[PDB]
Each structure stands twice: as structure tokens, then as C-alpha cells.
């Protein structure tokens, strides 16, 4: 009666002895798998009805899977939602919505080599002369992956920078922080730490990894994942927090473990009991722990009880003062620009200045309203589309429209209300190609700038 898929490198083991304790009490029997690809396949199986009844993933993938309306959107008391850290329920928030219950918090912290560093720097400002001392031994202050800007974001969003405004329990997609003065101040200190000789533009994630776990390199920036790597090295080290740029914390992007319940599910009362009373409580959790460290967790009581290791409350530090990854498709051009942006003021082919104003105005340009359209499931006489729900306050409703691809027959239509996101079209034909186009309308009669089309062949 309960169906749980978790990936095979989470205490699967662990969470399954949560289930026999479920079983034990209510007789009803929990099945723990952990497939290949499951979160690709996860979408396939939900949007024909199947699949499992609850699904472990990060967060910023359960934003798709709540634009194709996938998850069920979860009803936690106000009591339940104070157990956990305040910021873990904003990373499960979909167009008004929670869609899941946080389960566990990863960020990046800085890393630092005890024998070459027993006093790791407070501030990113102390580095430049951290590092003269250290060459003097051969040695830097410093490496890491500098050619991704999920590993630079910490410091260049110190200062003010940020990639889309979240306010109401909602992003603002036209309130992009990436030209700002405080980006600028963070990406500046960066490509001077460059111009300066103490990083090399071309330090790319396993040149870093080699420089620290060699004993090499006094600190790298690197998350949990890594840690493992630096035991079997035995270069002895620390977690801390990262260094602090202009006075103010560096943020790094917060990946929360989460755990949604299928919309599909016959079992929704039965998920909710399962992971409010039993998964979600110091018991279940070290069950879980036990099998597979979890890392941090959301649930405050055992954090708790975890930060006891220095490296567990660092990651919790680092995430409390970071930003949550925003679960929406428009951070796909986020990445793009800020890549671009990085890479260019590093080599010098552009200022700073200039490297983030195109990447500001690349992200913030005119595109599709909504975006994102997307087939989810199909089948030869129907298609379930999905599109992006970013701007459902301004719309009243979207216009969709079908019809065969190239053809002159009357276009189809209908409508659904603006606070949707997603759509069946049937009564179709096998292996006809057919475009899809959805116009966004406003309050005041007219369609926002760039209906979207796909094609599909059904």
C-alpha cells in the first residue's frame, strides 16, 4: 500500500526498517525501490496515474514535476511545519503550493587543510596574503571550481547579488540580480584574485580536487559529496564556514533532499502519516542515517543532534545563509549567462562590468509567456502538455490551440484558467505531427509578448 522510490545512493536499507515499523502498526506493507534513473522515469509512470506513491529527490527537479502537476500538493499543520528549519519549506513551494516535505539540506562549505592551516580566514578579503605566505612554502591558499557558477555564486552573491527575486513565497522572474553593484563587487574580487595570481582562470573542479587532496592546496570550496575523497586521502581537514566578503556571508545554492506524494496516489492519507509520523522524527531519520549519512537534515530536533559533527553544522550554516535553488526553468538561462559572464571577465576578453550587464540582459530578454511547454505523457489519441507557472498572478487564462503540423484544417482550441499549468488534448490521431501553442492573456484582453509552440508526433 505504500511505494517509495529513493535513489540506490540514499539509505534505501535504512528507510525500508521506517516501513516494517509502519507495517507493524497498521498492517500495511511498504515497498522501498530504488530504479535506475528514477528520476527520469518518475515523470513517465505519475502522468499515466502509475508509479510509486512517494518519491525522494532534490527539490529542483519537483519543480517540474509540479509544473506537469505530478505531486499532491501536501497539507502539513502549522505545529509539523515549525519542526523543521523555516527556509527547507520554501524550497518546496511551487505556484502556491507545497508539494513536498524537506528531508535534507546540502550547501558548500569552504574546506581547509589543518596542517597547512590550523586557523582557516574569516574573510575572503585575507586571502590575497594567505596566499603570499603559502606560495613561500610552495603552496596556494585556495583552489577550486571556478569554471561553474554554482561554485563562484557564493561570493559574487555575497554582496547583493542574486539570481531572481523570492518574496511572497514566490519568484519574481523580472527581478534578476546578476548586474547589480554587489554582484559586481564579488566578481571583481574573484577575477582580482586571478589578475593577481592566486587562482588560475583554468581550474576546473578535478584540477581543484587533486591540488587539496594531495596536501597541495590550503583550502577548496567543495560540497559533502567530496568528503568521502578527502577521507581516503588522509589529508587531515575541516568544514567551516565559508569566508565572509564585505562583512556578509558568501551564499551558496541549497539543494533539499525532498520527498513529494504522487497526484496519482490512492494512498495520500497513508504518505502523509508515513512521513509526517514516522520518517519525520529523530527515530526515523537515524534509521535512515544509520544506513546512509543524510548529511543535514530539515527536521530541527535531529540536526540537532548531527551538528555534533563540525562538518554537519558547517553545511547547515553555509545553507541557512545561502539561497535556495530556485526550482524553475528559467534558471537554465541563469546558468547559461552567469557561465558565460564568469569565464569572459576571468580571461579578460570583458570587464566585469560588462560580463554581467549582457548576462543581466541575456537572462531578463523577451521570450516565450508562459515558457517551458512541454509534452508529458502521451499516448496515439491524447497528449498531456505542461508549461511554466511563473506568471500566473498576471493571467487570466491561456489559450491553447492544436492542430495538425503544416495543415490548413480548423484550428482547435480551449481554455484553462490561469492559475493552471497544465492541459489533456485528445480525440487525436496516431502518427500525425501536430503543433501546439499556448497564449498567455492578461487581465485587460490581450496576449502577452510570445505565445509558445512545440511540435509532436503523435
Known amino acids: ?35 535506475d534513473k528514477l528520476e527520469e522515469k518518475f515523470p513517465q509512470v505519475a502522468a499515466t ?38 527556509f527547507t519549506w520554501d524550497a518546496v513551494r511551487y505556484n502556491g503550493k507545497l508539494i513536498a516535505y524537506p528531508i535534507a539540506v546540502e550547501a558548500l562549505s569552504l574546506i581547509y587543510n589543518k596542517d597547512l592551516l590550523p586557523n582557516p580566514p574569516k574573510t575572503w578579503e585575507e586571502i590575497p596574503a594567505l596566499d603570499k605566505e603559502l606560495k613561500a612554502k610552495g603552496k596556494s591558499a585556495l583552489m577550486f571550481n571556478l569554471q561553474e557558477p554554482y561554485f563562484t555564486w557564493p561570493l559574487i552573491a555575497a554582496d547583493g547579488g542574486y539570481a531572481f527575486k523570492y518574496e511572497n513565497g ?16 564579488g566578481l571583481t574580487f574573484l577575477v582580482d584574485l586571478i589578475k593577481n595570481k592566486h587562482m588560475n582562470a583554468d581550474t576546473d573542479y578535478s584540477i581543484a580536487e587533486a591540488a587539496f587532496n594531495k596536501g597541495e592546496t590550503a583550502m577548496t570550496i567543495n560540497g559533502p559529496w ?64 544509520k544506513d546512509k549519512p543524510l548529511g543535514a537534515v530539515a527536521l530541527k530536533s535531529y540536526e ?37 559572464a564568469v569565464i569572459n571577465a576571468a580571461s579578460g576578453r570583458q570587464t566585469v562590468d560588462e560580463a554581467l550587464k549582457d548576462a543581466q540582459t541575456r537572462i531578463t530578454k523577451g521570450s516565450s509567456v508562459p515558457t517551458n511547454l512541454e509534452v508529458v505523457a502521451a499516448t496515439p489519441t491524447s497528449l498531456l502538455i505542461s508549461w511554466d507557472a511563473s506568471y500566473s498572478s498576471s493571467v487570466s487564462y491561456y489559450r491553447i490551440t492544436y492542430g495538425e503540423t503544416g495543415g490548413n484544417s480548423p484550428v482547435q482550441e480551449f481554455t484553462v484558467p490561469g492559475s493552471k499549468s497544465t492541459a489533456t488534448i485528445s480525440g487525436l490521431s496516431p502518427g500525425v505531427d501536430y503543433t501546439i501553442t499556448v497564449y498567455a492573456y492578461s487581465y485587460y484582453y490581450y496576449y502577452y509578448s510570445s505565445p509558445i509552440s512545440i511540435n509532436y508526433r503523435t
Not at 514566490?170 to 563587487?185: F, R, S
Not at 558547517?314 to 547559461?336: C, D, L, R, V
Open 226 to 289: 567530496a568528503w568521502s575523497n578527502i577521507d581516503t586521502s588522509k589529508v587531515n581537514y575541516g568544514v567551516t564556514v565559508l569566508p565572509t566578503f564585505k562583512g556578509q556571508p558568501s551564499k551558496p545554492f541549497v539543494g533539499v533532499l525532498s520527498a513529494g506524494i504522487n497526484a496519482a496516489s490512492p494512498n495520500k492519507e497513508l504518505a502523509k502519516e508515513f512521513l509526517e509520523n514516522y520518517l519525520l522524527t529523530d527515530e526515523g531519520l537515524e534509521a535512515v542515517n
Open 304 to 340: 540537532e543532534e548531527l551538528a555534533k559533527d563540525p562538518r554537519i553544522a558547517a553545511t547547515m550554516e553555509n545553507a541557512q545563509k545561502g539561497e535556495i535553488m530556485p526550482n524553475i526553468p528559467q534558471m537554465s538561462a541563469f546558468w547559461y549567462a552567469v557561465r558565460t
Open 170 to 185: 514566490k519568484y519574481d522572474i523580472k527581478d534578476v540580480g546578476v548586474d547589480n553593484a554587489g554582484a559586481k563587487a
Open 49 to 86: 496515474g502509475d508509479g510509486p506513491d512517494i518519491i525522494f529527490w532534490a527539490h529542483d527537479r519537483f519543480g517540474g514535476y509540479a509544473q506537469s502537476g505530478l505531486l499532491a500538493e501536501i497539507t502539513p499543520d502549522k505545529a509539523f511545519q515549525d519542526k523543521l528549519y523555516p
Open 1 to 35: 500500500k505504500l511505494v517509495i522510490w529513493i535513489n540506490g545512493d540514499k539509505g534505501y536499507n535504512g528507510l525500508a526498517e521506517v516501513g516494517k515499523k509502519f507495517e507493524k502498526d497498521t498492517g500495511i506493507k511498504v515497498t522501498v525501490e530504488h530504479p
